[PDB]
Design a protein around this ligand. Structure first.
Ligand SMILES: O=P(O)(O)C(O)(Cc1cccnc1)P(=O)(O)O
Ligand SMILES: O=P(O)(O)C(O)(Cc1cccnc1)P(=O)(O)O
Ligand SMILES: C=C(C)CCOP(=O)(O)OP(=O)(O)O
Ligand SMILES: C=C(C)CCOP(=O)(O)OP(=O)(O)O
Ligand SMILES: [Mg+2]
Ligand SMILES: [Mg+2]
Ligand SMILES: [Mg+2]
Ligand SMILES: [Mg+2]
Ligand SMILES: [Mg+2]
Ligand SMILES: [Mg+2]
Lengths: 343, 343
């Protein structure tokens, strides 16, 4: 597996990430305590994921750039830009866990739930964001793609925040209005909150580093990647309820938080007026027995089978899009990524 | 007053800010609801302040740039960059109010206290931040100083967040350890949390737009401006307790929040072991009667007189620094700003 190959090299690079980020302290001992906190935040929140996004930058880089230009310096920059995407991920998740009132992340207590952290986590998340641009400046400032990367990260952050706004607006706490939960709305939420930053960004970053800046090449890459992103969020929604917290590393909250989940949207498409009543009575509440009633209804409508069938139809469709839109990029780039997220 | 002149033109420009920010919606009706929320957030949180920071960009621009280069386009860009600093301010304040558990801001209820907003305000704050860079791209991308402005805003944000980390670390909730509250620590907190973004940033932005990018000119400007920033935070700390909420627009929380305020640092310098006990017993608690005991001790030590005397010594010192370090920039730039914040 081409991700497995690159992994060990990528993950060890995090030591260098932390080192150069906390040598800002050398020239200013006055901020020592802040730099120590930064290190803690990084070590807690940027480590322990699958690294799909960061590894994708490196894999795509190695597949897009002529082996004659893969010197030690160019490789260090690739790992760094990969870690920038992982820091973006950490920024979004620390804040998302606060807003979604979640308990665990990646198999440990959410950072804001940690004793003595609490809403201070808001500033910690913003620091993670800031570190992206410090890394970009330190490693990439004299490269021709520097400004393109800066604008890409900024734009991806804006899109993600717009998506989060839609997520939160569609799920007002205490106000169960199931008519809002349409497929059209679902698709817009996930495109913005997940697809751009999780799928387009890491490949686009590699493309810029390879000198592929053409409007057309990026537009074609998007057509494939945003579709993969939709599937990825749908899988996340399924896993919120039907996943084993021991494997996912996080306790589900979509029902309690009144979210426009793929599951609730599919339920509303199949529900008799009497099933609709059950949903309306038990959705968006914290009571464990009410959540259990919604899961039992999902199970009745065979939603887990409907998801299985969506996964298969989706894989076939993404493969068709790769056949059409990959060129002039190597299909391997997209095939590797697809194999990582479906199987 | 040269701020008063420029004001009406600057403030009316906010209509154009909001318009171009919410025409992102024209090409994507799917995110309409998010764009409506963005508009609300802007109108609530970017309006109602003194605009000292944003006006400073415009004033300095008009004083630094040859009147022959102050066309309508260059002026529109100046107003925009001014509004970018006001958006940065709004980002920091929305988040700061959450973290500091504050009640009002600029004479209205804090955004996160508004019914139906709550911790969703975390994402709203991040959107304010994102809008800075959208404005910079839309108005300034083809100008020679574009990248310098982008790096300036990013770096100022990082410094501010480091400062906020020190603020929050020095004020752990429920853990009153008054020995931490030294002048040396106070000075480091305020330099980072306030001085860079409030004083250096707006002048530096004008300098870059005027083509003054020299290391030396910026280093000299900092020497003056960071000192002004220290005074400005000290005045803020005094006003938290001794200001009239009807004028300041915000209810004070420093005592309740266990903060390393200039006032508590000055108290510890003057206090008998028996006054020290009083402080230690009543500081960092929410009880109105305990807060009242701390204010009465401050009044005993004549802290309000000590502040008056600091204000005067500080004005004289800043004026001495202007005499030394302003050149080759016009002293008016710094004098105008000083007159705005002292009187
Ligand atoms: O990991 P989570 O919390 O299940 C999630 O995927 C996290 C997340 C944050 C931001 C953007 N996309 C996904 P969410 O959308 O809250 O279900
Ligand atoms: O307006 P406030 O809340 O009194 C304050 O000045 C706001 C603030 C936020 C961020 C940086 N500097 C000041 P704080 O430091 O919390 O006392
Ligand atoms: C956008 C989503 C669905 C958040 C989870 O992403 P991942 O499942 O890739 O989380 P980590 O590997 O980074 O933990
Ligand atoms: C950095 C500080 C002390 C926050 C308040 O700044 P201002 O007093 O300039 O607040 P507004 O005019 O923007 O309301
Ligand atoms: Mg979540
Ligand atoms: Mg969420
Ligand atoms: Mg989820
Ligand atoms: Mg505050
Ligand atoms: Mg504060
Ligand atoms: Mg204050």
């Amino acid at each position: 597996d081409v991700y497995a190959q690159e992994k060990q090299d990528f993950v060890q690079h995090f030591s260098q990430i932390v080192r150069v980020l906390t040598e800002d302290e050398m020239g200013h001992p006055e901020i020592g305590d802040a730099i120590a906190r930064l290190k803690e935040v990084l070590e807690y929140n940027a480590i322990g994921g699958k690294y799909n996004r960061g590894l994708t930058v490196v894999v795509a880089f190695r597949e897009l750039v002529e082996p004659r230009k893969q010197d030690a310096d160019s490789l260090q920059r690739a790992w760094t830009v990969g870690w920038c995407v992982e820091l973006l991920q950490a920024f979004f998740l620390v804040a998302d866990d606060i807003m979604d009132s979640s308990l665990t992340r990646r198999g440990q207590i959410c950072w804001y739930q940690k004793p003595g952290v609490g809403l201070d986590a808001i500033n910690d998340a913003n620091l993670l964001e800031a570190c992206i641009y410090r890394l970009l400046k330190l490693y990439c400032r004299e490269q021709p793609y520097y400004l393109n990367l800066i604008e890409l990260f900024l734009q991806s952050s804006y899109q993600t925040e717009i998506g989060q706004t839609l997520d939160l607006l569609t799920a007002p706490q205490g106000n169960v209005d199931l008519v809002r939960f349409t497929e059209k709305r679902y698709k817009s939420i996930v495109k913005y909150k997940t697809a751009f930053y999780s799928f387009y960004l890491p490949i686009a970053a590699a493309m810029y580093m390879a000198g592929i800046d053409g409007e057309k090449e990026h537009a074609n890459a998007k057509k494939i990647l945003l579709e993969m992103g939709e599937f990825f969020q749908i899988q996340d929604d399924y896993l919120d309820l039907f996943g084993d917290p021991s494997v996912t590393g996080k306790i589900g909250t979509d029902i309690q938080d009144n979210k426009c989940s793929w599951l609730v949207v599919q339920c509303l498409q199949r529900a008799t007026p009497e099933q609709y009543q059950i949903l309306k009575e038990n959705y968006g509440q914290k009571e464990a027995e009410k959540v259990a009633r919604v899961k039992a209804l999902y199970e009745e409508l065979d939603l887990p089978a409907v998801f299985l069938q969506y996964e298969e139809d989706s894989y076939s469709h993404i493969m068709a899009l790769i056949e059409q839109y990959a060129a002039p990029l190597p299909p391997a780039v997209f095939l590797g990524l697809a194999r990582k997220i479906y199987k």
